Each structure stands twice: as C-alpha cells, then as structure tokens.
Design a protein around this ligand. Structure first.
Ligand SMILES: Nc1ncnc2c1ncn2[C@@H]1O[C@H](COP(=O)(O)OP(=O)(O)O)[C@@H](O)[C@H]1O
Ligand SMILES: Nc1ncnc2c1ncn2[C@@H]1O[C@H](COP(=O)(O)OP(=O)(O)O)[C@@H](O)[C@H]1O
Ligand SMILES: Nc1ncnc2c1ncn2[C@@H]1O[C@H](COP(=O)(O)OP(=O)(O)O)[C@@H](O)[C@H]1O
Ligand SMILES: Nc1ncnc2c1ncn2[C@@H]1O[C@H](COP(=O)(O)OP(=O)(O)O)[C@@H](O)[C@H]1O
Ligand SMILES: [Mg+2]
Ligand SMILES: [Mg+2]
Ligand SMILES: [Mg+2]
Lengths: 443, 447, 49, 442, 433
C-alpha cells in the first residue's frame, strides 16, 4: 500500500507563529534550537531579497541533520524548487566537476512563464480551396484563401485560412469528418483522430476514434507553467527544430553534457531580465542542498567561493558529520568538518545535539505508529535500552523484522520474546567487530 | 539594472573612489578605505584606458577578507561597458575536454576585443504593382515594378536576371521588401496593414510593418564588437557560432591563430577595424599547475597580451605539482615579471562604515546600539561574518514585527548561529561523537 | 493579433549572419596553382585505390 | 603602437664577417652569445644540416628569449619560425608524441612559384571561320574562332582552335563582358560584366567590373608558400559539401587524429617529385621550445630518435634551471633538466648576467621605445633599484612613473615619482619579507 | 628515386659492408670498427634473407656513443628494397586513442608484407585522328579513332565509357597514349611531333603487375566500410581479434594456393629501456605466433628500475624477455677510430679539413664525447666561410670550441654559479647585488 523508508513521518519543522518550537511536532522530537535556526532560514528563502547566502548545519551521526534538511524542503512547499545533491555525484566523466557544480547552481533557481493562446478545434464539416482567376504575375497557380468549417458540440463555425496553414492540413492528410487542432499563435495544425460517430461505418478500422470536442469553437486560455533557468539553457543548447537530415541524426545521438559558455548564460539572463520587467514572468529563488560535503575536492571548494559571489547564486545549505580531518585533495591541510577555512568563513555554522534516552524511547514509539505495528510497553522499554546501548537507527531497524515474527506467532502485538528472538538473528556493528577480531579467516 | 537584481557578495561597490588627481576619498563610490591599494589599482585603470602598453601582469596580495575580490571587481565597474573583461578562476581551467594550455589560451583570447565597422547600400520600399510579361512576346520582356515610400515613389526597370530572381521569394506586391544594391539579394520584410483583415487565422511567417520613410536607397554604416576568440572559433569550424553557444570549441589548432593575426593586421592597416585592449582577472590563483605557470610566463610576451591581474591569499606554501615550497604559492619566475599590490586588514572605525553601507544595500534599518555589538563581534570574528548576521537579524526582528532590528534580536541571532571559532571548541570537546580521520566514531551514548 | 505581431517581430540575431560571412570570406584571390595536385583529398584516394 | 616586453630587439645586430658590435638592435653586452648565435644563423641559411639542436642556458632575466626572437628576426619573415612551449606538448586529444612530431613538421616550409600567360579584356565581337572539312560533308565546318579583346590603352584580335566553343559555351560569355583566358591551359573564366553597361538598367543583380588595365596580353608570376604540416592536414582531411563522409563531418566533431607514417612518406614523395623539376623549393625552418625543463622524460626520449631524422629541422632550446630531477624520474639528476643522453646531442651556449652599466643602458634604451623620457638623476635610482630588487622590476616601474607624472602633469619622471611608484608597487623580496611578519596567513 | 634528404647523422652509412665470408672490413660502406658487432648483425641479415625461421628476438646493448643505432641502420640499409622495415621508439606505443597492447600488436602487423602479382594487357600506339559523333540534347554518342604503330596501323571503335575518358584528358593525333583495357585508364607518355619516337613492337602487349600490401593494411581494411580511411587518417582503435584470426587463416590459404607470397620483415625498437611491464608480458607471448617478425632492440641503460615496478631489473628489462632474446654487446671506440669517423663525416658533409685541425679535433673528440666532435665539424665550415677560403684551421676550431660549450665544461660553470641558477628547491638569485 504505502512505502516508508526511514522517512515520511516528518511533515515539516512545526514552528509556531512566534518562532518558538514545540516540544514535539510534525514527527520531530526535541532539537528546539536547530528548529528555530532553520525557520529563520525558511523566512529568508521566502524573503527573496538575499542571494548566494549559505548556512551550514554540522553535527554527529544520526543527529537529525538530513531529516531536518528534508523538513525545510517540506516547509517551502512544492512551488519552491528544491534540488537534492551529494558531493559524490558532482564527479562526472563527460564534463569537468566545475560545470556540474555551476550547472546544479542554476538548476536550483526557477522562473514562471505565462502566455495566452487561442485555439480553434472541432470536426471538419466541409473544406474548400478558393483559387484566384487573376494570375498576378507572381505565381503560376495558387489559392487566395481556404475556407474550412469546424463542428463542435456547443456550436459550429466556418473559418477563413491562408494557403500555408491549409498546406499544413494537406500534410496532416485530413479528410472530412476528422477532428483537428488549429492554434492561432504558432499556426500549427494537429489531427487528433476521426470522429466517434463515424466509427460504425466500417467493420475493421485502423484509425482511432475520439469524441467531438466540447466548447463553442474558439477558446482563450493561458499557461502559467514555471521553468527553471537551467532548463532554458539546455533547451537553448539543443534545438528541436528543423527537418534537415542532419537534425534527425542529431536527435538520434545520445545527449552528451557539455560546458556551457558564460555568454549564452548572460543572454538568457538578459531576456529573462526583460520579461521580468514587462511583468510577463516572475523569477523565484530556490534552495540547493549538498550532503557529505567533506567528499568534495579542494578544487570544487575553491570554485564555491567564486560561485557564491554571483548575483544569481541560490541559497545553498551544507551538512557534514566528521570533525577536523584532512581535506580531500590536500596533503598536510587539516580543517574542521573537512571544509577549507576560507569557505567556512563564508558560511553560517549550526550545531546539532544528540538525543537523550527518553527521547529515543519516543522516537521508537512514533516510528511504530507510522509503521502501523503494535508494540507492548514492556517490550518498548527493552527496545529503548537496546537502542541506547548500540545506536538510535538500529532500533528503528529492529521494528521491521519483529512484525514478521509476530505474524508467524499470530500475535497482533510485539512481545519481549519476539524482539529477544530477533536480536539473535541480526547483529549490529559492535558485535560484528567483536566476532570479527577472533576467527580463522576474516570471520 | 539590466543585470538581475538579486544581491551579491558585494553589490555596493561601483567604480573606484579616485578623483582626477587619483587621491582616494575615505568613503566614496561604494568602497571604504584601502587608499594605497585603490590608487595602485587606478594606475592600472588609466594604464588600461591608455591602451598604448601591452603584455604586463600585476598581483593583488592580502589575507582572507581583506578586500582583494571587491578591488578587481571595482576596476571592472569603473572600466565601463564596451571594454571586454574576463573574470575566471584558476580551478576552472582544469577540463577534460580541453588541455590546460589551450584552455588558458582561450582565457587570454577572450579579453582583447575588436570593433569592426561596415557600410551597406540597400534599396528598401513598399511595392505597389509588379508586371511581368510572359506569352505576349517572350524571353524576359522587361517587366517594370513600382516601389512606394512615404516621401518618394519611383519606377524601376527589371533586368532578365532580376526577373529570374524575383520569381524566387514570390511577391504579390502589396508588400514591403528590400533589395541589396551590390549583390541584388531580395529580402521580404512583411506585408502591409491593409492585408491584416483577410484571414482570421494566419501563418507564423506573416507580419505587418510601417512603410519606410525618406529616400528610397540609403547609405548606412554598421558597427560590431567581436572578440578575437569569437573570430577564431568562427574560422575554426564550418559552423562555429553554434560551437560558441554549445561550448565545445574542439581545441582549435594554433595554426589558424597566426592566420587570424595576419587578418587583424591587414584590417588595422586598412583602418576598418580598431582593437580595444581588454583586462583579464584570475581569482584564487594559489592553486594552479606548473605547466600553466610556465605557459603564462611565455604567453605574456606576445603582441596582444591582455593586462592580467590576480589575487592570492596563501602565504609561503607548496605549489601544486611540485614538492618544494615557493613563496606566495607561485614560482619565482612568475613573481619576477609582475607587480605586487598588498592589502591591509581593516580597523574598527572602517568596519562600522562597511557594515552600515551594507545595511543601506540590504535596506535594513539599524539602531545606534546594534552597530556596537555587531562591530564588537565583527572585530573578533571576520568582517565577512557579521554581514550575514545583519541579514538574519532582519528576519528575527521581522518576526517581532517592529521596524528596526533591536539589540536583543542580534543577541538571539548570534546565539542561534555559531561562530567559526566556537565550532572548533564544540568539536574538540565532543570529538568522540564526531567521525575521526582514522574513521573511529562512538555512536552509542551508553557506556 | 496586435500582441502576436508585437511578439513575433523582435527577433534579434545575437551576432549576425553578416558577421559570419564577414569574418570568413578571404581577401586573397583564387590563385589557381598546381597545389590542387598537392592536395588529393581523402575522397579521391578512395577512387584511385 | 603596442609594446610588450620586446620590440626594442631588431635582429642580432651583427656586422659583415666580423665580431658583433657593442650596441646594435637594442642589444647591450653578451657579444659572445649573440655572436655564437650569429654563426647558427649562417648554419640555418646554409639549408643543409638537419636535426641539429642547440641549447642556451643561463639564469633568469639574462636575455635567453630575446636571443631566440633575435635569430627569428635575422632569418626573415619568409623563413618559418614556430614559437612553442614545453607545457603545450600535453594534450587530451592526442598523445604528446604525435603533437611533438607535428610541431617538428610545422617548422619546414615549401615555396611554389608559377608563371602563367593570361589574356584579359572586353569582347569586341565573336565570329566563326568556315573552312572545308577533311572528309566531305554537307554541314558547316569551322576551322577557327576569332575573339577580340579590348583593354585600356590597347586592343587585340585572337584566333583559337574550334574546341574553344565548348569552354565559351560553359562560361556563357557573349559580347561586352570581360573574360579571363589562360594561354596554354586554355578554356575561359568570366570575372564580371564591363563597367559601362551599368547604366542601361536601373536595377540589376550583376556587378560590373572595369576593363583590365594595361595590355590585353600579360605574363605574371605568383609565389605561394605552404608548410609540410599544413599540406598533410589537407591530405588527411576529407573535403566536400554534400558527400556522405562529409555529411558525417557535420553533426559530429573533428578531433586531431594521429597521422600515419605512410601518409607522411607519400607526401614526401610528391614534394620530392616537384622539387626535382625545379617548381618546388624546400626551406628548412626553426623550432623553438621555451622552458624545456617542463618536458617529461617520454618526450626527451622521443627527441633522441626524432633528431636523427633526415627532414628534421634545427630546434633551439632554452632551460634556465640548474641541476634538477628530470620529470618522470625521481632519482635521476642532470643539469638544466635535460637528460645526459640528450645533452650529448646538442651544443650549449652560456649566458652571463648583465653589468650595472649595462643595466642603466637597458633602461635608457627601453625609455625610447616606451616613448617616455627620464632625467639623469631619476635614472641613477632606477639603476640601483634594478640591481638590488631585480632587472624586470625597474623595467616594470616605467609605466606607473609615467602615469603618476601625468597625474602631476609633468612630462618627465622625477625622483619623487619613482619613489611614489616604489611605495605603490612592491617587488618579490619585499612581499616575501612581509609574509614572514604576518600571522594572518597572508 | 630520391626522398627528401638532408645531411643527417646516419646519412653516410649505407649497407652493412660485410664480406661474403661475413668477416667485417676495417673501413667499408661508411662503417668503421666494431667487428664482432657488424658480423653478429650480418648473421641476422642473412638470417632474415633466409626467411625460413620466425619468432626470434635479439638485443643490441652498449654504452652511449656506440653505433648500435647506426648498426641497425646499416642492417636496414643492407636489407634492401621490398623488405618492410619498421622502427618505433619505446615512448611511441603509449597512446590515448589506442591501447598500449593493441598498438604493440599493430607494430607487429606492419613488419610482415604480402606480394600479389597479376597480368594486365596494355595498348600503346600513336593516334592518326579522332572522330566522335554527338547530338545536341540527343543522348547517345558514337566515337571512332585510328591507332598507329610502326608494324601495325588499325582502327578501333569507341565505347560509351571510352568517350568520357577521351573527353576527360585531351587526346590528339600528335599525342601518343597508352591505355589498359580492364582498367580503362588513359596514360600519356608525353608529346610526339608538334619528343618521343613511335613505340616499337606490337600495338597490344600483356605485362605483369605486382602489388604489395602489409598485413596491418589488410587488417584495417576489413574492419569497417570506412576503415579504409583509417589507413591515411591513422584513426583506428580496438581492432577485433576475430578479424585477425580470420585474416591469418585466409593468408595461410593464400600461401598454400601459391597465389600470394609473404616477405618477412624486420621490427626494430629504439630506447626499449623505458616500456611498461604489460608490453613486455605481451611480447613474451606474442613472439611465439606463426608470423612473428624478427625483433631487434637497443638499450643504452645499465642496471636500473623498470617502469611500472619498484624493483630494479638488470639491463632495464625483465629476465623473461632477456631469456628468449639474444644479447649482442658493443664496445667503445679507439682514439684512431674516432679520427676515422670524423674524417668520413667530413667526406659525407663534403668539408675539407687540415691535418692539424684533424689531430686537434681528434684529441678534443677523445677527451669529450664523439658526437660533440662530430657536431663541431659542421660549424667549422661556416666559421671558415667568413675567412673567404675553404679550409678548416686549428684557429677556427679553437674559436668554435670557446663558442660552443661541452657538457662537462658546463657542469662546473653551473656548480660555481649555483646561486644564479634555479635550484631544485626553487631558490634563485636574480640580483647581482
Ligand atoms: N528529532 C528527530 N525526531 C524524529 N526522528 C529523528 C530525529 N532526528 C533523527 N531522526 C531519525 O533518524 C533517522 C536518521 O537520521 P539522519 O538525519 O539521517 O542522520 P544524519 O543527519 O547523520 O544523516 C531519520 O530517518 C530520522 O527519522
Ligand atoms: N572597499 C571595501 N569597502 C567595503 N567593504 C569591503 C571593501 N572591500 C571588501 N569589502 C568586504 O569584503 C568582503 C569580500 O572580501 P574578499 O575580497 O572576498 O576577501 P578575499 O578575496 O580575501 O576572500 C565583502 O563582503 C565586502 O563587504
Ligand atoms: N641585450 C639586451 N639589451 C636590453 N635588454 C635586454 C637584453 N637582453 C635581455 N633584455 C631584457 O630581458 C628581457 C627578456 O628576458 P628573458 O630572456 O625572457 O629572461 P629569461 O632568461 O628568464 O627567459 C626583455 O624584456 C629585455 O628587455
Ligand atoms: N661504426 C660506425 N661507423 C660510422 N659512424 C658511427 C659508427 N659508430 C658510431 N657512429 C656514429 O655515432 C653517431 C650516433 O651514435 P648512436 O649509436 O646514435 O649513439 P647511441 O648508441 O647513444 O644511440 C652517428 O652519427 C654515427 O656517425
Ligand atoms: Mg576572491
Ligand atoms: Mg623566456
Ligand atoms: Mg639510441
């Protein structure tokens, strides 16, 4: 029915209007400080005034960093673009890592576009060409105009068309009784299919049948679709137009990433900068998220310094676990969190605290309620002690298998004997190391 | 204003604060302090605006957050439009598609620009009537067409080859077209306004424009600004303009570059094209390969070398690609031909002006006592730090809904977000919790 | 139709077609030479082999 | 008028069959160096020896490169000279060996000279000449075709074989249009209509060129030079607009491909065939590699077998470094960075540092090309500064002193201006001394 | 007849210069000294000329300035035409577009060639006149002409494709041409009377034509339809091994049928001291194939470390390759032999030397390296050219000696001035004070 992987019980930060964090809300327990800290981040993202600002939240393992980084994305909403990214994903064989980093940087921000289109659609009743008897000296033979009637459920209307848009219809091979789609803006004609009433004419037919379109004839509609700037760049790099035999093989070839010049990006920023002035478009910032930033090379760390100073630079949040360690790509350099100090100077530091045992006992409870299973309190206490003795994420993993043993024992509720049986079949890391040390071949 | 309005690291800096005597003002043109460094930058500014010298390098030195990046950026703003400027990073020239040598050659090529002017003679006017006789006699019977303009109307005789040329791009008249004088090329601008009411739905090619005004044929010159790099990419490929936008250059052979240099030389001899000396700025050059250093040493001596400025905050350290440690992070050969400009750390008095001048940019009203705590924390921390707190305290004060940012909101903003110095302590005490270089970590709290 | 024409018309070439043929066409003449026998393009070698 | 660290060097500055002058071509001192290079200029002008390499070594700022630019000037613009850096050998497209072999063949050029008689002018008229055919027939038989030619200052009438009617029909020329006719090769070429015919039509798409100047019959010679590498690229690369292989040229990307030895030898065959007939002339060039210390031992190895080639040109090397570990081998130590086996194949030219009195003359000679004039008092400071700080520092301070002089409106540099320029721009030693006194990480 | 040629180090030596008894002469065919070396190389020469053996490796060792590279050059020169000879550097096999092992096999494929012969008829005769029949917009055309030779005067009608050929290249009665029936190609010897006489013999003759193609070419041609372009463009990679396995069988069948005969070649590798270990491990197995070209190498390096491994193998190669390979060493040169080499270099460059300048050049050539003394002899003529006389004098050799420095002379000059030169650590003093 529903799938739950170590998540989906967090519906947001759950902050009040004053900014104070509740003791427990939205599947989140404790960590009032880190919650209040991220709410102001959400407010700054909604403010739209700041660009390139970055805030780093660093804490120990299983302290709730990432779980919070999903909660801020839940707080922003579906309209605000959110791009998840991991440091190990930035390395690509096709293009240098730098173009991938700057690429995601533009993938974070997004833009909305609104434009109005007017379309005539309906079944073709009678279409006739109109030829001019005047030679005019320009052409040997042509048509002055083409009149095509359109039938729809609400009403019927006759249209007067130019010979070109009629030539498109001749390319579509449209015949009397077939529904067509004619748009005024681009002037493109598309045949949807043959009308449904004509289906009974033949016993066997290849063509599909569709009902007659609702609406009088003419329709006025606008499209509010929002599109990121990077998608405008990729659509700008590969044209979809043209009938040339070269363009066909260009569509056949696999898309290969390439380094985009700064000039094209500047032109896109120019046309968007004009459309935002006309009011036809509205630019909105977005949030970039990077996990395990410590895996980044010092080259990407250095390029992040110049990337954050750009005006179009979106807000980026970083999360790291390890303490002071050697930065990747550096020989003797030792820096906290695995980030160079020049970059740490630019960011803002947020620290994540561990969880008390009594909080862990509630975490197992909520994970059980979202898991829908049934846990006894006496076994709940033992599961809490077990989670505190080994790790917090090990008990949340222990909730899964016990449900199966309970079904084999037919008991609806988990019993202490069930989890005690589950502990022998499944071991954590500490026991695995102990048994690993003494054995013949690598345990 | 044409650029996107989203605020950047330094949006306040516009131009340089030097007068005609080059003496810097204490606070002007968006910047603050750094008098000697700003004057040393303005000497480079007039050095570029003069354009009589080429092939020189200059270095900007200083510790982190000393204003080295806001310095070269101020030079590009005072330099103005139409003067080509290239700002890249040393880490960006490492590419799998291009070799570092050629990738740096393109970095030197984009900076220097070229302005080309061209004159055109065209005949543009609206058409009235077009007559072409066919079966009356035969064989190009010399038809005549009447072109109309608002202030002038004449009749033109059409030749046989023009009769054949008018058939392609067929014209019914009632139309505005333009014919090239030199090549006899026919171009169709679009239909007049009287033809708009004929069809309810019309094709995408159709359009309506006003009748051209004035004389029928005119003499007009057009100016274009194209960098040498664009010329080389265009000449390297059958279609190189698409290679510009797709970003795949293909590592142009150095053989074509000499031919392009001879072409530019001939264009300068004829006087049709003049060159504008450009500027090249490389940020964070402390990480660069030695091959790039040597290729910079050689490539700086050519006839067209854009003026190069760079900023590196590393002290004496090992260069990338070699075991030994050269001073400044650069080989002594690159430091031999160069000029070093040093920047000094700001004082307390200047920091508060750098703060308030930032609140004017963020449009955040501050109390008189807020700059005191933000400046006090700004001295112990780095100037680049409290500038973020000036942004967060605006939102925290926005939750309280009242006007300017109060001091208590600044204290809460400092309490929620840790300083870089405090995180080191919190890590050092909690070390057992965080992962270690050796990979050892204690997950369980219970002992 | 007014907005249609107001949209369609402002299509600006980012550089030019005349800049492409301006920086391409060579000032030097044809200068018919024996170099045509010194080239022998790859397509002709398929025919001669 | 642009000057970058150069352009005051004009040639080597030698004299006729003698020791080099003290000061010539912007050169001061180092008479032995530019003399020894002066002999190398004669060796290159001999056009005999092949694969002979030489290496000039010395400290930085000793004038190593200016000597290579000088011999490049001494050879002349017609002799091909390829500036090259050791860092350029590494390319992602092809292996370093192929790039080195390509640059080795970029040095040698080839000149081609051709003399062709031409007939150009307007067309007065065209008439056939009817004569009896060898075998009797009813139809017409034309013995010759008469073509008149009008040019400025002259006029002429010609008689051609009847086979010209096919070429004239191909070129579609009739009357009053300037044509192009080559004497022995024949046929025709239509350049364009005569200029006097532009008035008959108000609008026409055909341009009208004026009548040819001078006699209608001319004899001219054209010399064209092409390097052997540029010749090979044309052989390896397919050429066509619509061809299927050329169709795959579009939509794909061209990339440098390793050229086979068979193709190179095949080009050498036809080049030799044309050089035997007297139509072709082979002039060897000069390859120049700056900073040879940056070359990997794999390239140093290929230079050993490459320099022993027969068509290999003269290559000049420059290495400033002293005893170093060759790139690619940590334990090996050789002078200048060049392996001893490669050092064995070349001749070393030493360079010496410049004297104080030579430095002052360097700056005073640089002032003329800089167009800035300085006093005698402020020059004596530039000398001492140049000797203490460095040579290229006093040469670098020239322009800032002039700009500051323009800010002070003075037309000549003053001691106050050179001191003010000293305070603004710091050399390497001062900066390295500042880095030690700062704990800021500066 | 003559490839592009300039004066080179290996120029003067032509042929190995060995007696019918295989004993070397003291001075022959540009080679002087090195008796056991030239004889041991001649045994390999007649070994390749025998062609009955395959898959053998030999090594030529020695110090620098030997002539082992010159010796192999003399083996390639004495090998003569029609025998393929491939010489590649050790650093050439490394390639970005091709695998090192694949390129190493590609080196083995180029050395062994195949000869195929065929017979094509030829018509050579003078033309009396040409008669063609065409129609304006009338399609079909009809040609006729008359060929003439001393003993035969005949008339040949022209086919449809013969017309296009005769129109392509202008044919006249004065012009004498030679045309093949099957090929249809028109060959013009030149111009007769408006300077060659009418061809003797019959009008129609049949002569044999021989075509020689290396194994590598046959390997590349059959890979792809455009694979033929890979011959000239040199762009090919990862050739299918099944194609090679099929080509070997087809070539074997061609040998059994007697249609095509194979010519065994010689593979020579220079500077083998630096090579990847995968290349050696591939050579060990690859030398055992049925068609293996005879491999001769050159290594001037002593005991050192092999590239790709940490340990130091003797001679610079692993023992597995040293096993099946034979080692032919070389020795240094006598003081008189150096004088002889310098003299024959003067004869090759055509430079007259004085006796005293020859003795002095021999002394400074023995103290220093030989190749250096061979380097000065070319500059001596240029220095003496300004004196307006053609001779080499001890004064000019002294001037050339002070102008151009020896390596050992520069080693001291670097060592005293080290403050001025750039140290390995990076420190340099560019200021005199
Ligand atoms: N405050 C919290 N309330 C509820 N669940 C939490 C909390 N903190 C962490 N978790 C749970 O712990 C699991 C793993 O934590 P995670 O955030 O992935 O650790 P890390 O940040 O080290 O990757 C998540 O599935 C999350 O549901
Ligand atoms: N002249 C100046 N006036 C005001 N603020 C400045 C000035 N120069 C630099 N800054 C401040 O310095 C910060 C950027 O420092 P930056 O030049 O990037 O240091 P670094 O280049 O060493 O990393 C900006 O936030 C800006 O506010
Ligand atoms: N004879 C000379 N007279 C005047 N200036 C010279 C002379 N020789 C060298 N120079 C100066 O030296 C500079 C070139 O030095 P260069 O040879 O590149 O140093 P390096 O030896 O480190 O390559 C030139 O700018 C030139 O002004
Ligand atoms: N027997 C010989 N006859 C003629 N020249 C010789 C002989 N031996 C050596 N040489 C000379 O030695 C020079 C090159 O020596 P070479 O064998 O290339 O050294 P290495 O063994 O280091 O490669 C050649 O120019 C050649 O003239
Ligand atoms: Mg910076
Ligand atoms: Mg140099
Ligand atoms: Mg050798």
């Amino acid at each position: 029915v529903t799938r739950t992987a170590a998540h989906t019980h967090i519906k947001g930060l759950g902050l009040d209007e004053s900014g104070v964090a509740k003791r427990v809300e939205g599947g989140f327990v404790g960590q009032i400080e880190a919650r209040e800290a991220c709410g102001v981040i959400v407010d700054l993202i909604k403010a739209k005034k700041m660009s390139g600002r970055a805030i780093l939240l660093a804490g120990g393992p299983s302290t709730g960093k990432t779980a919070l980084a999903l909660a801020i994305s839940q707080e922003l909403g579906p309209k605000v673009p959110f791009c998840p990214l991991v440091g190990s994903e930035l390395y690509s064989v096709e293009v240098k890592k730098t173009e991938t980093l700057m690429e995601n940087f533009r993938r974070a921000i997004g833009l909305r576009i609104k434009e109005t289109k007017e379309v005539y659609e309906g079944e073709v009743t009678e279409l006739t060409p109109e030829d001019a008897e005047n030679p005019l000296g320009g052409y040997g033979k042509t048509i002055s105009h083409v009149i095509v009637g359109l039938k729809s459920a609400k009403g019927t209307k006759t249209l007067r068309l130019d010979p070109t848009i009629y030539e498109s219809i001749q390319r579509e091979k449209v015949s009397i009784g077939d529904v067509i789609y004619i748009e005024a803006n681009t002037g493109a004609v598309k045949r949807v299919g043959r009308s449904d009433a004509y289906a009974t004419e033949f016993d066997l037919e290849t063509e599909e049948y569709v009902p007659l379109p609702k609406g009088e004839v003419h329709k006025k509609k606008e499209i509010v679709q929002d599109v990121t700037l990077h998608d405008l760049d990729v659509a700008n790099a590969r044209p979809q137009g043209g009938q040339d035999v070269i363009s066909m093989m260009g569509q056949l070839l696999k898309p290969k990433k390439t380094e985009i010049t700064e000039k094209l990006r500047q032109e896109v920023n120019k046309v968007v900068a004009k459309y935002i002035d006309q009011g036809v478009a509205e630019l909105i910032p977005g949030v970039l998220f990077i996990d395990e930033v410590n895996m980044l090379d010092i080259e990407i760390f250095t390029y992040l310094n110049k990337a954050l100073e750009s005006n179009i630079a979106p807000v980026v949040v970083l999360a790291s676990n390890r303490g002071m360690t050697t930065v990747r790509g550096t020989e003797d350099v030792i820096s906290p969190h695995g980030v160079p100090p020049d970059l740490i100077d630019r960011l803002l530091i947020v620290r994540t605290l561990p969880y008390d045992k009594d909080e862990i006992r509630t975490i197992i409870e909520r994970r059980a309620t979202v898991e829908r299973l049934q846990v006894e309190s006496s076994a709940l206490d033992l599961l809490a002690t077990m989670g505190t003795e080994t790790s917090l994420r090990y008990a949340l993993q222990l909730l899964a298998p016990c449900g199966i043993l309970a079904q084999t024992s037919n008991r609806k509720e988990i019993v202490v004997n069930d989890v005690n049986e589950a502990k022998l079949l499944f071991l954590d890391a500490k026991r695995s190391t102990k048994i690993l040390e003494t054995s013949a071949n690598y345990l | 204003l044409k650029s996107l309005s989203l605020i950047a690291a330094h949006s306040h800096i516009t131009g340089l604060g030097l007068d005609e005597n080059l003496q810097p003002r204490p606070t002007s043109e968006g910047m603050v302090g750094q008098l000697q460094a700003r004057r040393a930058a303005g000497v480079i500014l007039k050095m570029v605006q003069n354009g009589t010298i080429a092939g020189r390098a200059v270095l900007v030195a200083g510790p982190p957050s000393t204003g080295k990046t806001a310095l070269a950026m101020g030079v590009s703003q005072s330099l103005g439009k139409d003067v080509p400027f290239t700002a890249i990073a040393g880490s960006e020239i490492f590419s799998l598609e291009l070799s570092k040598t050629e990738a740096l050659t393109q970095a030197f090529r984009k900076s220097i620009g070229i302005k080309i002017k061209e004159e055109t003679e065209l005949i543009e006017g609206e058409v009235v009537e077009i007559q072409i006789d066919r079966s009356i006699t035969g064989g190009h019977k010399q038809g005549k067409l009447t072109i109309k303009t608002t202030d002038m109307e004449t009749i033109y005789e059409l030749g046989n080859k023009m009769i054949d040329g008018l058939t392609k791009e067929k014209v019914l008249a009632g139309d505005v077209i333009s014919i090239d004088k030199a090549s006899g090329k026919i171009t169709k601008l679009g239909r007049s306004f009287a033809r708009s009411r004929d069809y309810d739905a019309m094709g995408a090619d159709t359009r309506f424009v006003q009748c051209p005004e004035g004389e029928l044929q005119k003499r007009k010159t057009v100016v274009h600004t194209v960098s040498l790099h664009e010329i080389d990419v265009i000449n390297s490929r059958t279609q190189g303009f698409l290679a510009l936008f797709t970003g795949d250059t293909g590592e142009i052979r150095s053989e074509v570059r000499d031919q392009i240099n001879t072409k530019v030389a001939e264009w300068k001899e004829e006087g049709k094209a003049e060159i504008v000396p450009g500027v090249l700025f490389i940020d964070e050059v402390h990480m660069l390969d030695i091959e790039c250093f040597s290729f910079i040493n050689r490539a700086l001596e050519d006839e067209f070398a854009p003026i190069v400025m760079m900023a590196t905050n590393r002290g004496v350290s090992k260069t990338r690609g070699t075991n030994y440690k050269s001073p400044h992070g650069l080989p002594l050969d690159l430091l031999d031909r160069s000029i070093i400009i040093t920047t000094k750390s700001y004082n307390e008095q200047e920091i508060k002006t750098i703060l308030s001048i930032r609140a004017q940019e963020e449009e955040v009203e501050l109390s008189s006592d807020a700059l005191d705590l933000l400046t006090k924390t700004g001295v112990e921390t780095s100037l680049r730090y409290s500038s973020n707190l000036i942004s967060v305290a605006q939102q925290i004060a926005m939750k309280r809904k009242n006007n300017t940012v109060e001091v208590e909101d600044v204290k809460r903003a400092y309490l929620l977000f840790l300083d870089s110095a405090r995180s080191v302590k919190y890590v050092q005490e909690n070390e057992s919790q965080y992962i270690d270089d050796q990979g050892n970590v204690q997950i369980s709290i219970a002992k | 139709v007014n907005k249609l024409r107001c949209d369609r018309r402002p299509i600006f070439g980012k550089n030019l077609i005349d800049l492409l043929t301006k920086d391409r066409r060579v000032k030097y003449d044809k200068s018919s030479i024996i170099d045509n026998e010194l080239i022998k393009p790859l397509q002709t070698r398929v025919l001669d082999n």
